[PDB]
Design a protein around this ligand. Structure first.
Ligand SMILES: [Ca+2]
Ligand SMILES: [Ca+2]
Ligand SMILES: [Ca+2]
Ligand SMILES: [Ca+2]
Ligand SMILES: [Ca+2]
Ligand SMILES: [Cl-]
Lengths: 376, 376, 376, 376, 376
C-alpha cells in the first residue's frame, strides 16, 4: 500500500503535480515497459516508411495511415474503461473491507471471558489465536505474499498460530475443501466450554461472542469468495481487446506522413507523437489501475499489506486479551468533574479555529416576522 | 466459474495480454459464431457488389453505403451497453452473494446444540441437513445444472438430503407454490424441540439459531426472487435492438467501395474490414458479458458452480456439526505465552517486506513548531 | 412480471435474438402506437413536401431541414436517459425488495408460539393473519391491481384477512391517515399477551417476534414511502422534454430532400427513414423502460404480481404456522451417518461436472523454491 | 411533495406527455424566469445586431458569432451535470430515508410498556412524546417550514410536544450545541425507570426499546449531519459555472447571421432560436432538479412535507400507544380455519389475473432425457 | 466545512448564481493561482509569437498550433474526471459517516449504568471519557488539525481526555502500532466490572453496552483504514496526467493566429482566450473538488471540523451521562391527554400548508365500476 494522505491533506497550489513525482506504486513504474514497446513499434514503422519503402509503397502506406486514422474513436474505449475500472475499484475496496480484523472479538473476549489465572489466560489467548489462525489460513489461501510467508501448515505451526495437537486434528479432519473454518468451529466449541465452566458468566455474553465470531468468519468466507469468483474473464478480455484495437489504430494512423504530399491535417512532421504518447499513457494507465487492483493480494506496491496486518492483528489481540485484561486504572475524577461544561484547550496553532460560530441548524437565521409566528 | 486471480495477482509486463490467450469462458468461445455470421454477411454483400451488380446497381449501392455510413453513431450504443452491462454485473454479484451458505448456522449449531450421544448427533445433523435441503430445493428450482442433477424429489431423497418420511410429509403438504421454505420451518420446529429437551441450553442460543436460520432462509428467498424477477425484457430488447441496428449500419456502410470512383474517405480497398470486425468484437463481447451473466445459474463456463457448492456445503456442515463437535485440543500454552509482544517469523522470500515502516497515521510527520504546540 | 430466465440460462448463439421475438411485456407492445404516430407525422411532412409545396416553399423547406439536421445532438439525450433510467431501475428493484414477505415471521411463529390446541392454533393463525392484513392494506393503498381486488374494507373482510370485530375496531380508530400499521400494533399486543399467558416461552422469543414484526412493518412503510415520494416530476419532465425535442429535430431534419438539388449528404432518397425509425425505437424504448418501471405496481406486463404474492404469502404462512407446527418426521439417521465424508450422487447429464478440480485458493500453484520457504 | 404515481401506474400511449401538462412542482414553474431572461438577452443581442450596428460592426459581430459557435461543446457539461445531479438525487433520497419515524418505537412501546391505568398510559404517552419532541427539535433545526411553524421553544411547548417543567430542564441544560438528543436521553432514563418499576416486564424488552430508540436518534443525527455537511460548494460552483459558460457561448454564437453574407451553416434566419431555447430548457431544468433537491427541507413544491409528517407521526403514535393498547378483538377462528389451503376471492375486474401459471422456478420446463436423470 | 443549505433551501430565480459570489471554500480560492499560471503561460506564448518570432518561425508556430488544436479531445478527460471525482466524493461521504459519535453510547450509558452517587457518576463519566479518548486518539492519528491541537499524549492528558495513571498504563503497553483501541478495551473491562458490581443491572444491558462500544470502535477503525488505504496513486496520477495533457494541448493550440494568414477557423483574434480560460476553470475546478475532498481531515475550508466535533461530543456526552441522569421531569398528563386525535397548531406563516389533502395512497382515486368490484 502506497500512502499519500498526508501529502494531499490540504488542497495546495502544487497539489497533484507533486504526486506526479512519486515513483513507488506509480503509473511510470507500472507502464514504462509498455510505453517503450509502443514507442519502439511506432518508431520502427516510422523508420520503415522513411528509409525502406519505395515511392509506391510509401504512397500506399500514406493511404493506409489516412484510412486507419478515421477509426481512432476513443469515446467507446473511454466508456468501457470507465465502467470496467469503476467496477474493479469498487470490488477492490469491498475486498479490503472483507479483511478479517480481531478488534471486535478481542474487545468482547476481554469483557466477557474472565479469570486472571492461567486457565482464564489460556481461554482468552486460545480464542484470539483461533481467530488469528482462521485469518491466516484464508490469507495464505488468497494472498501470494502470505502464502510465501506460510508455504505450509508446518510454517503455520512454527509461526505459533497452530499447535502440534491442533495440527494433528486439522490434518485428521477429512475434507477436500479449504479448512479455514475449522478454527472458527474450534472457537465455537471453546466458547461453549468456557460458558459451561462459568468463565463466560452469561448466555448473553456467549451470544455476543458467537455473533462476533460469525462476523469474523463471514469476512473470511467473503475473502474466499472474492478470490474464487474473479471479475468475468470475458469482460476483462473485452476491455483489453478494445484498448489494444485503439492502440493499433493509433500506432498505424498516427504516423507522420510526408508534408510534401499535401495531405489534409498532415503538413507538420514532429518525428515524435507527443500527443499519441500522452493518450497511450492516459489510457494504458487507466487500464493499469484495474490491472493492479484486480487482485489486491499480490505483491504490487499498492496491494494490501496482508503480512503486516497479520502481525498487527496477532500482537494487538494478544495484548488486549492477556495483558490489558482487568487492569483498569483506579477510577478517579476527571478534569471537568466539577465543570458544568467541558472543552479541551486549543493550541496556538489551532486556536484560530475558535471564533467560528457553532453550527446549530440551517434555519436559525430566518428571522421571520412577529405576526407570521402566531399560532392559529 | 473461470478463475484467473493467480494470473493477475501482480501487475506484470504481460498483464491482460496473457489472459487474451485463454479459451475457457472466453470472448472467443462466446462470440466466434456471431463473428463468423457477421463476416459472412459482409463478404456476401462485398462479393455481390464486386461481381453481381451492374454499373448502375453499383452506383446506387455506393450511394446507399455512403448514406448508411453516416448513421454509424456508436456513442448511444456505448451509453446503453455501459449502463445495461453495469446493471447486469451488479445484479450478478448480488445473486452470487444471495447463495445460501451453512457456515454460520453450522458454527452456531456446534456451539449451541449439545450432546455427544446419538440423539445430540441426530439433532445437529438433522438441523444441518434441513438447511442443506432448503438450499438444494431452491437451487434445483433456479439452476439448470442443479435441476439436471436432481430432476425429481426422488433424486433429492436418493441423494440423502431428504428421508422417506420427510418426503411423505413434504408431498402431503398442500401447496401450489415452491416449498423450499418447508425445511426452514422444520428447522424452527426442531430447534424449539431441542431447546425444550435441554439440548439447547438457553433461550439466547435458541434466538441465535433462529436468527441464523432466518438469514439462511432469506438468502434462499432472495435467490427465488432473483430467478422470478428477470431484468426487464423491454430493457434487454432495447439493448439488443440498438446493437443490431448499429451492426446493420456498419455491415452496409463499411463496404469497401471502388477507389476508382473518387469518393471521399474511400481511396483504399482492403477487402477485409479489420477495424469494423474489431468494433464488432468489442461491442458484441460487451453484450455477451451481459448475455452470460444475466442468468448466472446456467451452464456457461463463468456460471456459478452450484453443484460443487452443494457438495462442499453439505460435507463441511456435516463435518463441523458431527466430527468437530466438542473435540477441542487440550488447552495448551502457545508459543508467545511469556513473550510481551508477538510477531510470527518471515521467510527468506518475504523478509524483504520487513523494514517497511509501520503505518501509525498520516499526521505523524508534521513536526510542528514548539510555540504552536502550546495550549492557550 | 415477464420471466425469461430459463431462456437466457446459457449464453447461446441465438441469445437475445430469440428474446426479440417475445410480445408480452415487450418493446413492440409498449411502443408500437408511438412508432405509428412518429411515422405518420414523418410521412405527412414528406408527402406535403413532395406533393403540396411550391418550388419556393420546397426550397425554404430544404433550408429548414438542413438547419434542423444540425441540432440532432443525441449525446446529451443519451446522457440524460442513461442516468434517469438507471435511477428508475434501481428504485424499481428497491421497491420490489421493500415488498413485505411473511416467511421470517412465520418461521419465528412456528418456532416460538406453542400449543397444539385450538388456542395455540388461534394465536399462530391470528399473528400470521395480522401480518397478511397489514401487507394487504398497504398493497391496496399502493397498487392498482390490489385495490381493484379489494376496493373496500368490506372486500378485505370478505376475503378473510379481517374479521367483523376487527373491522369495527379498525373503523372506530380515529385517524385521518393510512391505517396499515394497525395490524402491526395488534400483532405487538397479541404477542405480548401470548408471552404473558406462557404461549411464548421466553423473553428472547418475544424479542425475536417483535424484531421480525418491526422488519415487516418497516417494509410496509417503505412501500408507502415509495408510493408517496415519486421520482421528481421536474426530472421526469426534463427527460421527456429532451426526448421530444430530439425527436422533433429528427422528424424535421431527417426528411429526404430532392437529390436533384445537389445538397451535401442529400443525394439518395429512400422514402422511408429506416435508421431514424431505428433511432426512435431505441430511444423511445429506453424511455419506455423507465415509463413501465416508474410505478411497478400498475397493470403492466412487467409490473409486480402483487395479487399472486398476496395469495402465496397467505397460503404459505397459514400452512407453516398451522399444519406444519410440531409436525416433524421422527429423528432418523441420515444416509451418511457412518460416512466420514459426504457427497451426493451425480446424474449422467451432470457427472461431467466432476473431474473439475476443487478450488482451494489462488495461491496453491505458486511452487516456490526451498530456500525461499525458510523462516528467518 | 408532488405525487404522480397513480398517473404513471401503467405505461400508456400518452404516458409522460400528460405529465408534461402539470404545473405544480414542474420545470415550467422552476425555470420560466430563467428562460425569459435568456430569451431577453438573446433578443436584445439580435435586435442590436439587426438595427444598431453599422456594417463593419456587423461584420465583426458575425466573425465573433462564428468563433463562439465552435465552443458550444455540450458533452462536458452533460458529463458534469449528469454526475452532479445523480449525486444530488441519491443524497436527496438518503436524506428522506433519514427522516425519523415513530412506527417501530410505538409498536415496541405498545408491546412492552404495560399497565392499563393512568400511570401506564403516562409512561407510553411520555415515551412517544419524547421521540416526537426529538424529531420536532431536529426538524425545526433543519427545515425552514418546520422552523416557521415552531420559531421558538415556546412554540414547541404550546404545540404540546414539551411541557413547562421539561422546558425548564431543557433550558437549564448548559450546552452551546443543538439539544435534539435531550429527549432521547430522557427516553432512556424513562425506559430504565419503567423497567425498574416493572412496567417493562423484562430486560429483553428494555434492550429492544433502547435499540429502537438508538435507531430513531441515529436518524435524527443523520438529518443533522445532512443539514450541516452540504454538497461541496466547489462542486456546486463548478457545475453552475460550466452551465453558465455553455449558455453564454450559445447566447453569442447562436445568433442568426444575415443570410446575404453567405456564411456556412448560416443561410436561414428564423428570428428565434427554437432549438437553442429547447437546449437551454433541457440543461437548465437538469440543473434545476439539483437546485430543488439540494435542500429537500425548504418550501419547494417537491420538498418534503415535514409538517404533515410531524402531525401524522404524533397522532399515529399517540393512538397506537394509548387507544390501541391491550384492546385486541377477541381471538376468533378465521375464514380458512378448516380449509387446507387459503386463497382470497378475486373481483370481476381482476379475475383475469388468474389462469396465469404460478411461478415455481426457471428450471421446471427443461424436460431432460430419461437416461440423463440416472445417478452414477 | 462550508454550509450553504439555508441559501439553497428553496429553488429560487437567483439560485446558484448567488452561490457563485461566495469566497470561502470556493472554486476561486482553490484555483486562482493555477488560473494565473495558465494565463501567464498562454500570454507568454502569445507575446513571443507576436513580438519575438521571425516570419518563418511564426509560420512554423502556426502549423504547430493547428496541429495541436486537433488533439483537444475533452471527452476522455471528462470521462476520467467524472468517474474519479465520483469515487472521491463517495469516499469522502463514507469517511464522514465513519467519524465516531458518542450519542448512542451515551444514551445506553445513561439508561443502563446506574447510581446517583460518586461511584455511579465515575462509572458513567469514565466510560464516556474512554469513548472520547479513543476518538481523540484516532483523530489525532488521521487529522492534521487534531494533531496540531494534540501534538503529544501529554497534550491529550492536559486536555483531560486521559489521566496520569491511564497515560502510564498506555505507555507501558508494549505495541508498535496505533493504540486507539486501548480505550475501547478499557471500556470493555470497565463495563464488565460495573456489571459484576451491580451498577449495570442485567446481562442484556451489558450486551447492549458492548454492542454500542463495538460500533464506536469499528467507526474508529474505519477512520484508520480510510487514512491508511489512500485512493490508488496510479489512478490519481492518471487523472492528473490526463488533465495536464489536455491543458498543454489547449495552451498550445488555442493561440490566436494572425487573421491575415487566412487559416480556417482563425480569422478573429481576441487576444484573450475567454472560452479556453472558462474550460480551464471548469476542468481544473472539477479536479480541485477531488483535490479538496481526497483528504477531508486536512485544513481546507470544506474539510471536516474535527476539533469542533471533538468538543461537542465531549461536552454532550458528559452532560448526558452526568447531569441528565435520573432527573426526568415528573410524569404529567400531556396537552392531548383527553383528545382522541392529536395535531399541533400552525403559525400564520405556515397555516397555508393545511388544506393540502392528506396522502392516503396512489390507488384511492380509481373509482372503479360497481360490477367490477364483485368477488367471483
Ligand atoms: Ca495486484
Ligand atoms: Ca448464464
Ligand atoms: Ca408500471
Ligand atoms: Ca429545496
Ligand atoms: Ca482536504
Ligand atoms: Cl439480543
Amino acid at each position: 500500500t502506497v500512502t499519500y494522505t498526508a501529502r494531499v491533506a490540504n488542497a495546495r497550489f502544487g497539489g497533484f503535480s507533486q504526486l506526479l513525482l512519486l515513483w513507488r506504486g506509480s503509473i511510470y513504474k507500472l507502464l514504462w515497459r509498455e510505453l517503450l514497446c509502443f514507442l519502439g513499434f511506432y518508431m520502427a514503422l516510422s523508420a520503415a516508411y522513411r528509409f525502406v519503402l519505395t515511392e509506391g509503397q510509401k504512397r500506399y502506406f500514406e493511404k493506409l495511415v489516412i484510412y486507419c486514422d478515421q477509426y481512432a474513436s476513443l469515446i467507446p474505449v473511454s466508456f468501457v474503461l470507465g465502467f470496467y475500472v469503476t467496477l474493479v475499484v469498487n470490488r477492490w475496496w469491498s475486498q479490503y473491507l472483507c479483511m478479517p480484523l480481531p478488534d471486535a472479538l478481542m474487545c468482547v473476549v476481554a469483557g466477557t471471558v474472565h479469570g486472571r489465572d492461567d486457565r482464564g489466560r489460556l481461554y482468552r489467548r486460545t480464542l484470539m489465536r483461533y481467530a488469528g489462525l482462521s485469518a491466516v489460513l484464508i490469507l495464505r489461501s488468497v494472498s501470494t505474499a502470505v502464502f510465501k510467508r506460510f508455504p505450509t501448515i508446518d510454517h503455520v505451526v512454527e509461526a505459533g498460530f497452530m499447535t502440534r495437537e491442533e495440527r494433528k486434528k486439522f490434518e485428521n479432519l477429512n475434507s477436500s475443501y479449504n479448512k479455514y473454518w475449522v478454527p472458527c468451529v474450534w472457537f465455537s466449541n471453546l466458547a461453549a466450554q468456557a460458558r459451561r465452566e462459568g468463565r463466560i458468566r452469561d448466555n448473553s455474553a456467549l451470544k455476543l461472542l458467537l455473533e462476533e465470531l460469525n462476523v469474523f468468519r463471514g469476512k473470511c468466507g467473503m475473502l474466499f469468495h472474492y478470490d474464487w469468483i474473479s471479475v468475468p474473464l470475458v469482460y476483462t478480455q473485452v476491455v483489453t481487446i478494445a484498448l489494444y484495437s485503439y492502440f493499433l489504430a493509433c500506432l498505424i494512423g498516427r504516423q507522420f506522413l510526408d508534408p510534401a504530399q499535401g495531405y489534409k491535417d498532415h503538413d507538420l512532421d514532429l518525428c515524435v507523437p507527443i500527443f499519441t504518447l500522452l493518450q497511450f499513457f492516459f489510457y494504458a494507465g487507466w487500464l493499469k489501475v484495474a490491472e493492479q487492483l484486480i487482485n489486491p493480494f499480490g505483491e504490487d506496491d499498492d496491494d494490501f499489506e496482508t503480512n503486516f496486518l497479520i502481525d498487527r492483528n496477532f500482537q494487538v489481540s494478544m495484548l488486549a486479551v492477556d495483558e490489558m485484561y482487568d487492569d483498569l486504572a483506579v477510577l478517579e475524577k476527571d478534569l471537568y468533574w466539577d465543570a458544568a461544561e467541558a472543552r479541551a484547550p486549543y493550541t496556538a496553532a489551532t486556536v484560530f479555529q475558535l471564533r467560528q460560530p457553532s453550527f446549530q441548524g440551517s434555519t436559525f437565521d430566518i428571522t421571520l416576522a412577529k405576526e407570521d409566528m402566531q399560532f392559529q
